[PDB]
């Protein structure tokens, strides 16, 4: 229905930036949520995905160095970075991509990595 | 395990004209797991079709979603100045979830 | 214990509401188990397949599905996926032998098949070896889905679709999962000789 997000910034390389995605009218505790990346001047690709149950999925390029957690008190979505590399400078969207739909996407923040 | 090639990479449509956009999987995949959706420059992507045979909400249903076998074609009947944006097609099997490369649309 | 009804049958259940037949207290014969054409997979996760003919077991259970080709690898004991986590989960301490079929001319009509279904939506994971018959509507949001689908509602059962010319994957693999659980009360044979 309506999902917002915030929590970006500029991060030194190898430092971890905590990413967030709140929601409104959508319970993230049981849904098909996934993240997508827009590197500048490039197309989209996977980031990660969390099932309604406690099963996650990762792209093989970004396997590891990642986590996805959904809080139960607040209906938000969280992913925490780890050991960041400077090819991850991109724009991150949290999504409600069902397998029989595309859901509602998000304004998204800009995560940049520079020295 | 797949690549999703979209041809052509650019298309020079004139306003008020029909548009045909097709993205072909590497294998003879099923139709019940691929979706096309818009992307405005700098904004959030918007859903267009699901399963390549239906429409989505808040859409005038003037976009034709078809495709059988390997060549999955999107047919656009009428177009407006607000609808010039790039198009991505996503395949989501459940074990392989490869993406596509967008096609820029302009006059 | 013929093992001739889970195999060579004209009826095969979907991933949800999967069939399950007990093979209790009869004369087993695993030498006939091999010759039903080269299987796509005959992985034996517990006992050795060559020693399984003459070893001592207990009550066994023979499951029966149809399963899409690219998701037959989610029958290993701990995997994540729609088939692995929502419809048919296997225990981590498995002792069975999953066997595929690679059927493409017997479970796929020319115009497609819609009586072969699988559940896509569930609000929680599945305990291993659990039948999951259900019809009622899923609710993905802050709105009750009383008796009608609708935005923020989906019918939690999707048809597979099995048309010819779909490839090695995307084709209905009949899957039998012969579990060999031991209950310390042996009834089947322990080596025909």
Author numbering:
A (entry chain H): 2 to 116
B (entry chain L): 1 to 107
C (entry chain A): 334 to 526
Give the published text:
The receptor binding domain (RBD) of the spike protein, which interacts with the host’s angiotensin-converting enzyme 2 (ACE2) receptor, has emerged as the primary focus for powerful neutralizing antibodies. In our current study, we characterized a fully human neutralizing mAb called CR9 against the Omicron variants. This mAb was identified through screening a Fab antibody-phage library derived from a recovered donor who had survived a SARS-CoV-2 infection. The human monoclonal antibody CR9 specifically targeted the RBD region of the Omicron virus, providing neutralization and preventing the virus from entering cells and causing harm.
According to the previously reported classification based on binding sites, mAb CR9 belongs to class I antibodies. These antibodies which were most elicited by SARS-CoV-2 early infection, target the receptor binding domain (RBM) and potently neutralize the virus by blocking the interactions between SARS-CoV-2 and hACE2. RBD formed by Y33, Y52, L99 and L100 from CR9 heavy chain and T421, L455, F456 and Y489 of RBD. RBD-CR9 shows that Y53 of CR9 heavy chain could form one H bond with K417 or N417 meanwhile, which might be connected with the broad neutralization activity of CR9.The CR9 epitope includes 7residues, forming a relatively big patch. Among them, 4 are immunological hot binding residues in class I antibodies, including N417, N487, Y489, H505, which indicates a low probability of mutagenesis of the above five loci in Omicron variants. In this way, mAb CR9 enables broad spectrum of neutralization capability of neutralizing most Omicron variants.
